[PDB]
């Protein structure tokens, strides 16, 4: 899907999580963050699609979505040992990863 979609995604699963009473619904939402953080890391921008793989600017592009992804593990383990408080205090601190990682981009 698109990057926008993705962008929309993560902010919906985002809601869901400070707004989650348990840790299955937690877990349920950062599993859906983490596909639509690989999602968005194949949705190239149009500024960029003549760019190689090689590329600083496409080194930057990736890795932004390999550092929100390996957060959103983080948080996935949280979740998985049932720790929902600090689950959402994590996917809290995601914001900024995915703001780093889609804004400049959009
Ligand atoms: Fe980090």
Known sequence: ADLE???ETLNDNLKVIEKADN???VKDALTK???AAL???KATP???EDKS???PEMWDFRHGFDHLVYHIDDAL???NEGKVKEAQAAA????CHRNAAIQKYL
């Open 39 to 41: 999602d968005a890391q």
């Open 33 to 35: 963050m983490r596909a």
């Open 46 to 48: 149009p500024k960029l």
């Open 92 to 95: 809290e601190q995601l914001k």
């Open 23 to 25: 840790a299955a619904q």
């Open 77 to 79: 383990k949280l979740a």
């Open 53 to 55: 793989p090689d590329s």
């Open 5 to 7: 979609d993705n962008w």
